[PDB]
Structure formats: structure tokens, C-alpha cells
Design a protein around this ligand. Sequence first.
Ligand SMILES: [Mg+2]
Ligand SMILES: [Mg+2]
Ligand SMILES: [Mg+2]
Ligand SMILES: [Mg+2]
Ligand SMILES: [Mg+2]
Ligand SMILES: [Mg+2]
Ligand SMILES: [Mg+2]
Ligand SMILES: [Mg+2]
Ligand SMILES: [Mg+2]
Ligand SMILES: [Mg+2]
Ligand SMILES: [Mg+2]
Ligand SMILES: [Mg+2]
Ligand SMILES: [Mg+2]
Ligand SMILES: [Mg+2]
Ligand SMILES: [Mg+2]
Ligand SMILES: [Mg+2]
Ligand SMILES: [Mg+2]
Ligand SMILES: [Mg+2]
Ligand SMILES: [Mg+2]
Ligand SMILES: [Mg+2]
Ligand SMILES: [Mg+2]
Ligand SMILES: [Mg+2]
Ligand SMILES: [Mg+2]
Ligand SMILES: [Mg+2]
Ligand SMILES: [Mg+2]
Ligand SMILES: [Mg+2]
Ligand SMILES: [Mg+2]
Ligand SMILES: [Mg+2]
Ligand SMILES: [Mg+2]
Ligand SMILES: [Mg+2]
Ligand SMILES: [Mg+2]
Ligand SMILES: [Mg+2]
Ligand SMILES: [Mg+2]
Ligand SMILES: [Mg+2]
Ligand SMILES: [Mg+2]
Ligand SMILES: [Mg+2]
Ligand SMILES: [Mg+2]
Ligand SMILES: [Mg+2]
Ligand SMILES: [Mg+2]
Ligand SMILES: [Mg+2]
Ligand SMILES: [Mg+2]
Ligand SMILES: [Mg+2]
Ligand SMILES: [Mg+2]
Ligand SMILES: [Mg+2]
Ligand SMILES: [Mg+2]
Ligand SMILES: [Mg+2]
Ligand SMILES: [Mg+2]
Ligand SMILES: [Mg+2]
Ligand SMILES: [Mg+2]
Ligand SMILES: [Mg+2]
Ligand SMILES: [Mg+2]
Ligand SMILES: [Mg+2]
Ligand SMILES: [Mg+2]
Ligand SMILES: [Mg+2]
Ligand SMILES: [Mg+2]
Ligand SMILES: [Mg+2]
Ligand SMILES: [Mg+2]
Ligand SMILES: [Mg+2]
Ligand SMILES: [Mg+2]
Ligand SMILES: [Mg+2]
Ligand SMILES: [Mg+2]
Ligand SMILES: [Mg+2]
Ligand SMILES: [Mg+2]
Ligand SMILES: [Mg+2]
Ligand SMILES: [Mg+2]
Ligand SMILES: [Mg+2]
Ligand SMILES: [Mg+2]
Ligand SMILES: [Mg+2]
Ligand SMILES: [Mg+2]
Ligand SMILES: [Mg+2]
Lengths: 50, 64, 84, 96
Amino acid sequence: GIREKIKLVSSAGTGHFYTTTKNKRTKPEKLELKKFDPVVRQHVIYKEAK
Amino acid sequence: PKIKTVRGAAKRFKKTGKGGFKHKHANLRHILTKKATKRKRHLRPKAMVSKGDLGLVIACLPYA
Amino acid sequence: AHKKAGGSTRNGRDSEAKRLGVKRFGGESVLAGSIIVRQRGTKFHAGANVGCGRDHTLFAKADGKVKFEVKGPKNRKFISIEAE
Amino acid sequence: GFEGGQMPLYRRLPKFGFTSRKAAITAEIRLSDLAKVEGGVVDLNTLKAANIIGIQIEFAKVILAGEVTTPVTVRGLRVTKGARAAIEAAGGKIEE
RNA sequence: CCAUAGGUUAAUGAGGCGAACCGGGGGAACUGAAACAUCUAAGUACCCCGAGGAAAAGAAAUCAACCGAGAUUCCCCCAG
RNA sequence: UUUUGUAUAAUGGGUCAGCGACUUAUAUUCUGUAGCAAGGUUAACCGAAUAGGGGAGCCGAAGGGAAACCGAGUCUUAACU
RNA sequence: AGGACCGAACCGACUAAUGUUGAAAAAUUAGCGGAUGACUUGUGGCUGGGGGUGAAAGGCCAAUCAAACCGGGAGAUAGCU
RNA sequence: UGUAACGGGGCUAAACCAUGCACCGAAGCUGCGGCAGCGACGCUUAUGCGUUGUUGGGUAGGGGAGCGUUCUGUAAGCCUG
RNA sequence: GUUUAUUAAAAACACAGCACUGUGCAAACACGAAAGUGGACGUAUACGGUGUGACGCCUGCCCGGUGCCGGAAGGUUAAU
RNA sequence: AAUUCCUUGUCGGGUAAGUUCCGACCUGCACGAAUGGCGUAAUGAUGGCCAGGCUGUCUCCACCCGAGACUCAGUGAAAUUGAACUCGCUGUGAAGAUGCAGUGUACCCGCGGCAAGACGGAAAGACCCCGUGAACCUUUACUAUAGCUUGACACUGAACA
RNA sequence: CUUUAAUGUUUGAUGUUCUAACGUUGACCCGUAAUCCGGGUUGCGGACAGUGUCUGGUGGGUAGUUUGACUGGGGCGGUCUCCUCCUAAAGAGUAACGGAGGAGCACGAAGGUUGGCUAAUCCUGGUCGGACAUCAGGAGGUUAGUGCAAUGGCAUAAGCCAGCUUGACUGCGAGCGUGACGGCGCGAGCAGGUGCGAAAGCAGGUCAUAGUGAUCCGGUGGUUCUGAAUGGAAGGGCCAUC
Ligand SMILES: [Mg+2]
Ligand SMILES: [Mg+2]
Ligand SMILES: [Mg+2]
Ligand SMILES: [Mg+2]
Ligand SMILES: [Mg+2]
Ligand SMILES: [Mg+2]
Ligand SMILES: [Mg+2]
Ligand SMILES: [Mg+2]
Ligand SMILES: [Mg+2]
Ligand SMILES: [Mg+2]
Ligand SMILES: [Mg+2]
Ligand SMILES: [Mg+2]
Ligand SMILES: [Mg+2]
Ligand SMILES: [Mg+2]
Ligand SMILES: [Mg+2]
Ligand SMILES: [Mg+2]
Ligand SMILES: [Mg+2]
Ligand SMILES: [Mg+2]
Ligand SMILES: [Mg+2]
Ligand SMILES: [Mg+2]
Ligand SMILES: [Mg+2]
Ligand SMILES: [Mg+2]
Ligand SMILES: [Mg+2]
Ligand SMILES: [Mg+2]
Ligand SMILES: [Mg+2]
Ligand SMILES: [Mg+2]
Ligand SMILES: [Mg+2]
Ligand SMILES: [Mg+2]
Ligand SMILES: [Mg+2]
Ligand SMILES: [Mg+2]
Ligand SMILES: [Mg+2]
Ligand SMILES: [Mg+2]
Ligand SMILES: [Mg+2]
Ligand SMILES: [Mg+2]
Ligand SMILES: [Mg+2]
Ligand SMILES: [Mg+2]
Ligand SMILES: [Mg+2]
Ligand SMILES: [Mg+2]
Ligand SMILES: [Mg+2]
Ligand SMILES: [Mg+2]
Ligand SMILES: [Mg+2]
Ligand SMILES: [Mg+2]
Ligand SMILES: [Mg+2]
Ligand SMILES: [Mg+2]
Ligand SMILES: [Mg+2]
Ligand SMILES: [Mg+2]
Ligand SMILES: [Mg+2]
Ligand SMILES: [Mg+2]
Ligand SMILES: [Mg+2]
Ligand SMILES: [Mg+2]
Ligand SMILES: [Mg+2]
Ligand SMILES: [Mg+2]
Ligand SMILES: [Mg+2]
Ligand SMILES: [Mg+2]
Ligand SMILES: [Mg+2]
Ligand SMILES: [Mg+2]
Ligand SMILES: [Mg+2]
Ligand SMILES: [Mg+2]
Ligand SMILES: [Mg+2]
Ligand SMILES: [Mg+2]
Ligand SMILES: [Mg+2]
Ligand SMILES: [Mg+2]
Ligand SMILES: [Mg+2]
Ligand SMILES: [Mg+2]
Ligand SMILES: [Mg+2]
Ligand SMILES: [Mg+2]
Ligand SMILES: [Mg+2]
Ligand SMILES: [Mg+2]
Ligand SMILES: [Mg+2]
Ligand SMILES: [Mg+2]
């Protein structure tokens, strides 16, 4: 269970977020993905958090 | 004496129009990253009690 | 001793049966969305009006009558539906 | 609720909701209840005297149930759109 | 040293008993939870003190909700 | 009586007579029956009263939603064929 | 002189037999140990139950003891017969 | 323990193998008489009758219908020196 | 000598002797919510606890663990 | 060896013959120094072994004397018991039969005596297992707690360094 | 700020005395005919000791309890959830302390899409180089490969490579499969907003089947809900999460 839960928070500032897992011993850089924001109903950049 | 309702059951069932009981689905509390979004979306709405379980629920909820 | 103590086995494990197989056979009248066969791999391939799910579950994409057939150069088993 | 020793149904399901204290004091009045009121005007006080609703009731609604056949005034009571159409057709006047 | 403690006498009162009810001071465990420790049984059983024909409580530093009610006690609802 | 199974060498009874074990109160649900019926019924209490009074209340005629709220619709959702 | 020796009363209880619905809910018979001592005995008193007392065996505490007896909680509980 | 490996007597078929016709043989079937449950149909208006088919082993258990005992009203009636 | 009154009298218990240890007296310790009492009208040649068990020859090595005694610089640490 | 499993270890003594006994050896499964080691005169209703005397302990029982047993008169229990017109054998069968099958034998009823059976009588097995049973005991099981101990505050004050 | 000297306050500590609380099972007097007690005087000790509340440690001294099940009796051992195969008798399902193996993950690429590509092994020839490295040809045809067990599947590849990219999307969801139930699984299609492709189209994770934990209790973010006189707020509810 090396992979740990991480939170991806939208850059639109609406407070919505997704959850996933990441291996942090390798690939230590932040994860960025254009994902759908259900509140503003648009695709915005989500940034690593938690 | 009056029959005493099971308060834990009265905090978990609600009576419907025809006399059935509705309940919140299980498996939607604390381990939610690994669960698929389709599965959680189906667990979000309320569900009717099953015919095999109406007997226990009516016994626990006399007044309702 | 009066009795000889035995050993222990190491084979006690097994997994639950997955209820695979053909659900509706030839001639069945099915609604759209009805599951025809539940499979591991594509033992039966999807024909006309039949869809294949992620676990290779063959399901009806239309109302009609199920038909099994053998087609193609490889003599593979296809499931199709005559719309009725 | 005992199931032999496994987790019972009323304990393996989650709790939900809360009991609102406003619902206790809110009541409902049918159109047929209007005709069994004396005075020609429908109020909290007048309905409590006629015994349609309890005395703890602070909020009331008129819903489309039964049939109203007489002109009557409903003042200061929320009324659904179906009841409003029915009351107007029966000739009553509605206001807040 | 005055005093006070102590001593004598006299006057009045109490003592002890009693089935339940009542107020107060102490206060279980079996049992239930299908085990058990929080919890329950239960402030029950029991022990003790006191009083009366009743006792206790009682005349809002009380409720209510922007309307108002008006000490206490008991019964039926509220409401399992 | 207990059992898969008892003539069982498995349990119980020496015999007779008397006694000896599914009750009662309250609450809830279903059935039957009776009254009334979109209504039904009172509780305490009053009453000399099995009468009469007493509708405080409770059940039913509306549901959906966690809830505000809306309402023969409602919830879900930005919106639902 | 002696927790000295032999041995009655007196205190005990090693062996055998009898007895075992006994003469007796622990005795009888024949032997047996101590017998001036850490002995034995009469009368009275004191220690009380999770307590007493115990040259200690979980022994004894009214024919009852790994927690006396009596009354109460109590119709404890008993998925057992 | 005693013949004790046809149930026995006994059997040279009264054994075995074929063929065939008889007969015995159950609470099965049929005949005669009776009772009951269910269904169908007809009639009567029913609250039943008739015809007809069929059913009727039974533990746990479910359903239905009764008998009898003590006491209350009918009953200051009726039975009874 | 004592012991399982009523299936065990023994090699068991006790014992004189030995050692360790506590205790300076309002002693340690014990029975007591407490007052008190025993220890003891005793005072370290006394008293308590523990182990061993006349006497003779002796009682060897280990303080890492648990306990006990002593230390107190530093780390951690309660109510406040 | 009160300790040694292998083990009746091996050697010696005692006996015609000794798994016990005595003395040695040491291969101490698994002795050991105050939960004391080794020895020890005396003592012991203490454990084991040997010898003399003595004998009905025995070879192997015989006889005798008394109390019962046995008979008569009087009084007069008890455990137990579904009912009983209560045989053997072989087989069967809840798998060991007076009762079932086949078969054999057997006139009816007492009294004395024996104890093979009636899975005889007695005690709802004490061994074994089960109960989400009990009790008591132990501990570095859990949770507490009496006690012991630590500090703050209160009873509790003055002055100085 | 490493620092000393010094002013001043507070805090904290220590030691030293004092008497006046408190202790006295020291003496003497009185109540008193009294080894109790109380009062008085005096000596000693002395704000210590002791006690009350709070608090840390210690505490089988005492107390209440727990100490699982399966099991060819129990104990010992082994096992307990999930996946694959056989037993399993050609639908599903099917037991044993039956026979064999695995899982408690991994991957922002190892996912989506477009385009492209096709192995194992052997023979022949070829520098180090050989049985076996890279190369050319041939045979052969999946005897390979699949992130990890086994079964089924895979060439239109589900296997291999590259470009672009985030659909590992949000709200739903006809219908269906599978469970006593809790629940689990499949799913076209609809809406919104996306990615790849010229386009038809494909994409709601991975070739599929293990990689998992109900409820309660809390934590975090948001919220058009509720808010015990009213306006807030705490707390609760809903949604997303631990
Ligand atoms: Mg949540
Ligand atoms: Mg294996
Ligand atoms: Mg469980
Ligand atoms: Mg009313
Ligand atoms: Mg308790
Ligand atoms: Mg208890
Ligand atoms: Mg319990
Ligand atoms: Mg229980
Ligand atoms: Mg009086
Ligand atoms: Mg019986
Ligand atoms: Mg049995
Ligand atoms: Mg049996
Ligand atoms: Mg039979
Ligand atoms: Mg018999
Ligand atoms: Mg019998
Ligand atoms: Mg009997
Ligand atoms: Mg009776
Ligand atoms: Mg009823
Ligand atoms: Mg009725
Ligand atoms: Mg002597
Ligand atoms: Mg005498
Ligand atoms: Mg004896
Ligand atoms: Mg004698
Ligand atoms: Mg002597
Ligand atoms: Mg003597
Ligand atoms: Mg006794
Ligand atoms: Mg006791
Ligand atoms: Mg006890
Ligand atoms: Mg005792
Ligand atoms: Mg009780
Ligand atoms: Mg009882
Ligand atoms: Mg013979
Ligand atoms: Mg016949
Ligand atoms: Mg029949
Ligand atoms: Mg019948
Ligand atoms: Mg004895
Ligand atoms: Mg004695
Ligand atoms: Mg002796
Ligand atoms: Mg000793
Ligand atoms: Mg030593
Ligand atoms: Mg040490
Ligand atoms: Mg030996
Ligand atoms: Mg020899
Ligand atoms: Mg020897
Ligand atoms: Mg040894
Ligand atoms: Mg020791
Ligand atoms: Mg030692
Ligand atoms: Mg010794
Ligand atoms: Mg002696
Ligand atoms: Mg006689
Ligand atoms: Mg016989
Ligand atoms: Mg026989
Ligand atoms: Mg016979
Ligand atoms: Mg014979
Ligand atoms: Mg005889
Ligand atoms: Mg006999
Ligand atoms: Mg005899
Ligand atoms: Mg016998
Ligand atoms: Mg017997
Ligand atoms: Mg159990
Ligand atoms: Mg003293
Ligand atoms: Mg302790
Ligand atoms: Mg304990
Ligand atoms: Mg078990
Ligand atoms: Mg066996
Ligand atoms: Mg085990
Ligand atoms: Mg199959
Ligand atoms: Mg099959
Ligand atoms: Mg892949
Ligand atoms: Mg407010």
C-alpha cells in the first residue's frame, strides 16, 4: 500500500475536488489534469493538494 | 404498557405512501476513493426495504 | 501413543462460483439490455444488435429473438438478434 | 430485530436526515375543511375553533383536496396553485 | 482575681411500641445487553433517622414568545 | 419420552384417590363480526346513574423531500423524453 | 535433673477383623502411641463469614465449609433436561 | 453354550435349467351397505336438496367443528321426601 | 511434639539453632472510616517479617532480567 | 538417587534362582550448595531389604467349643417394583433377548443353599465433551480500587540573607 | 546576537532565625475519690508535621470480568476474507482437516484515441562471440506475448511502437444478471462539457475474473437546508471526502 490517497482541487476556486492515488517516491512532481468541474460545468485545470 | 419503538431503527427507516419503508444505502461512508463513480452514484439515492426484511422492520417500528 | 496425531492439509481454498454461462438460449425473446451470456473472454462474439461489455458480457441492443450462429473464416460463435 | 448474531438490518444501514421542529407546528387544510368552518373567513384562529387543526399550529396550507362549493375568504394562509384556481372558480377572494 | 467550667435542688418535656402510606441519610447484586467493563436492573431490595393523620411541595429571581398565562399536588392527553 | 432408528438390556412411572402446567394486564398488527361512515370514537372528569354530558385528544380523508419548501404531485439535476 | 525410661488412670488413633438397611450418620474387639509435659481436663470469657482461627490438612467455625447458617432481592437466570 | 451356513421336518426332487397352463396369495382392485371432505351442475331462492366426479395413512405444524365440568342470567320458573 | 473430627499421621507442619531484613519508640507492624487497642507497661542482648531447619564439614561463580537500596547532572512528565 | 527416560544399565555381594536390597562405576534424558550440599550418634505405630525364633500364612486342610444360620411360639421391617401366565439354544434386532423367528426341553407348588444372568439394587457419571454455566485460585490478561507515595491549594504566620 | 558590569521590578528557589496558629502518647495544678477527658501553666517542636480537595506514580492487597469457532472426542497443529482450476455427474449451483496455486496490489501511463507493426523455436552464413548477445536469409506459424496465479480469451489482436491527449468526465439511466438480505455486477441510450480522428466513429479506466471492511463515532472542504423568544452563532442535515 505504498500509493497514497491525494486530492485534486479545481483551479476555478469552487471548492470541488477529485480523489485518486499517486506514488510519491517516484514522479515527485505535481499532477495536473484538465478535468470537468461539475459546479461551473466547464473543463478547468485541477492541481495537487492535501 | 405501550410498545417501545427501536430508536435506532426509527433513525434509519421512513414510511412511504403505500406502507413500505425507505432506507439510505450502505457502503457510502468512509472508503470512497477506490469506489467507482458509477457505483457511488447508484448508492446515493434512497432505496425501498426488501420483502424479506419488511418483517423485521415492522416488528421494530410498531407506530411509525 | 494411544493415538497418532495427524498432519494438516494445505489445499482448503476455493473461490465463489461466478454464475457464468448462457442466460438466454436460441429462440428466446428478449428486451433491450437483456444479458444473453456471461463470459470469461469472448467464447461467443457479438453479432448484429448485440453488444459486448467490459467483462465480455453479451447483451441485447434491441428487442427481438436470440440466434446463435457460426460465421467468419475462424468458425467463431457469434450471437445476433432478429428484430421482431 | 435479532437475526441470530449477525449485524441486524437496523444497525448495518446508515442513519440519515434530521427531525425539523417547524414541521411539528405546520399543518394542512383541505378544501372540504373550509366549508365546515363558520364565519366565511379562514384563519389560524378560526380553524382552531372549528377543530380542523391543532392549537400548536403556526403555519397552514390549503391544498387541492376535496371540492369547495361556496364563496369563502382565505387571509394570511399559503395556498397552492391548484387550490387557488379552485377557490377563484368557486368565487372566493384570496389575499395575504 | 472577678469569672467560667463543674456540683446540688426544683419545674417542664422526651424515652418505648405500632401494618401500610410520607420526608430524609446510606445503598446492592442477581438479571438484560443473547459474553462483558460504559449502560441496565435501580435509586429498586435492604439498613438507618424523623413526622403526621396524612406527609412532602407550594405562592415565580416560573413558563411562554412579541400573543399571553399566573402557587403547589393529583388524573387523562400530549407521546413511546 | 427422546431420537436416523427402541420389545429394547435407553428415560419415567409400585398402585389408587385428590391436586399439578399456555394465564392476566396494557400496547400494537391481522382476521371474523357489529355499529357508523369521508368520517369514526371519546379519555380523565361531571353525573345518584352501565344513561346523559365531556370531542381535550387519537385514527382517516395527500403525498414527496434530510430539510426549508412545494403539492396530485414531489424529489433528483443546470434540465430532465 | 530430664519436652528422661517402663507402665495404669487420662489423652490419642498405627494395624487387623467385625460391622456397612450397623448396637453406633465413624463404633466394637484384639493389639498400638504419649503418659511431669509444646501434657490433660472442668467452669466462665473473647475472636464472626471474604471474616475468624489454623505447630498449615484449605483444616476447623454446632453431623453444613475453596467462603457457615437464617431471612430477604427472588418466581435470580437456565439457547439445558 | 447346542444341531447352528435350506426357518424346520424332510427332499435325488420337494434342486437347477427351459416351456405352458392352473391355483394360493395384501387393508391393492372389484362387489354390497354406510359416513365424510372438495368440485361441477341443476333447483330452490339460497341459508338446503338432488345428480355426478373425485378424495378421505399421517408426526412437527396450520385450518374447521364439537362434547363435558364449575359458576352467572333466563330462574321467586321447572324437577324433587 | 503437631496435622487432613469422619478413607492420608507421613519424608509433610513445628522445632531449638542459623542467616537476611525492617524497626530509635507516638517504633516498625496489625485490628480499626476514627478514637483507640495490641506490639509493650517492652526499648536494638528488644520487637516484626522472610527463608532455612539440632549438631559436624561447608556453603563456590553470575547484579545482564525482575525486585530492593542509594544517587541526581540531564531527557520525559500531573493537577496548577 | 524419593531425582536415571533408555533400564531388569554394567560389575560385585547376598539366593538354587533377586526388575527389589547392599557396595561400586559415572553415559547426571533431567544432582548440587540456607526454595541448602554432604555426613551423622540417638530417636520413629516412617519406606525398603535380609536373617534367627516362631508358627494353620501356606503345602492341605481336619476336629472341637460357643453366637447366628435351621425348626417351633410371640412381635414384626427394608431397599425395590409398568404389568407378568418370568425355560435352553441358534439366529435376528437400537448392533449382547424370559418375551421376536426356528427349534429343543419342560407335570403343579414349596423349603435349604450358591451367586452366572435379569446390561440386578443404590447415587439425573465424578472420567470425557458441551453451556457464549458457576465458584475459588494465580499472573508482567483487562478495567478499576483500598493502601502507599508525589506535588498544588486550604488550615498557614513574621523578619532577614 | 558571544559577552560582562550595573540600575529596577517580578517570578522562583534555598538556607537562617522568630512565635502566635497547629502537634505534644514531656512536667506540674484543677475538675477529681480518676494512667480517660477537659481547662490552666510550663517546656519542647513549629509554620514543619498532620489532615481535607485536586493530582502524577505505584498497587492481584482486594474486586468485577474476559480468555472464539471449525475439528472423524477434545487438546496440539492447521484453518477462518477474496481470486483460478479440479472434484462438479456436457445449463446454474453443489460438501469434506479433498487435490493444486494465488490476492491484501500496480500504472498519469501500463489509461483514451489515431496511425503503424507481428512472435517462440530451429537451420545456414557472419569480428571479438562461444550452445546461447547484435546482423542477413530460410523454415515454422503463435508452439510467443499479456505488470503479477490459474482458467477462458486475444491477429479486426486484448500482444508491440510512436504522435496527440485526460472520457481514470458530471447528473442520470431502458433493461438485465446474481445474491435470504446487506449488497454486487452489466448496460444501450439521454443531457452537459471534453479528448483523439478527415470522417464514419471510439472513449464513464486498465484482456476479463482477486487487490478488500457494514454501522456507529468523529476529522476536513463546500452548501439555494435547519438554527429552541428574534437576528446571528454553536450544533445538526445534505453533498464531496478521511
Ligand atoms: Mg459523509
Ligand atoms: Mg496448494
Ligand atoms: Mg460476530
Ligand atoms: Mg382538537
Ligand atoms: Mg452488573
Ligand atoms: Mg455480573
Ligand atoms: Mg447478559
Ligand atoms: Mg444471555
Ligand atoms: Mg399523631
Ligand atoms: Mg418418559
Ligand atoms: Mg439419543
Ligand atoms: Mg443415538
Ligand atoms: Mg422393533
Ligand atoms: Mg427385560
Ligand atoms: Mg425400560
Ligand atoms: Mg423406575
Ligand atoms: Mg388445570
Ligand atoms: Mg389482539
Ligand atoms: Mg373490526
Ligand atoms: Mg517421658
Ligand atoms: Mg473420662
Ligand atoms: Mg487414620
Ligand atoms: Mg482399644
Ligand atoms: Mg517413648
Ligand atoms: Mg509411656
Ligand atoms: Mg462440622
Ligand atoms: Mg461467606
Ligand atoms: Mg462467594
Ligand atoms: Mg478462612
Ligand atoms: Mg430481582
Ligand atoms: Mg426457579
Ligand atoms: Mg459344536
Ligand atoms: Mg384380501
Ligand atoms: Mg385411502
Ligand atoms: Mg387425514
Ligand atoms: Mg482422617
Ligand atoms: Mg485429632
Ligand atoms: Mg506419628
Ligand atoms: Mg524445609
Ligand atoms: Mg550460594
Ligand atoms: Mg539487578
Ligand atoms: Mg527405571
Ligand atoms: Mg546382580
Ligand atoms: Mg545403589
Ligand atoms: Mg534427574
Ligand atoms: Mg527462598
Ligand atoms: Mg537457593
Ligand atoms: Mg534438608
Ligand atoms: Mg513422634
Ligand atoms: Mg416366627
Ligand atoms: Mg438365552
Ligand atoms: Mg441371542
Ligand atoms: Mg422361541
Ligand atoms: Mg434343551
Ligand atoms: Mg430357593
Ligand atoms: Mg447373581
Ligand atoms: Mg449369598
Ligand atoms: Mg452383576
Ligand atoms: Mg445398576
Ligand atoms: Mg454458544
Ligand atoms: Mg502506644
Ligand atoms: Mg492489583
Ligand atoms: Mg482476581
Ligand atoms: Mg471449540
Ligand atoms: Mg473416531
Ligand atoms: Mg490452535
Ligand atoms: Mg455445471
Ligand atoms: Mg449437470
Ligand atoms: Mg494493459
Ligand atoms: Mg434563536
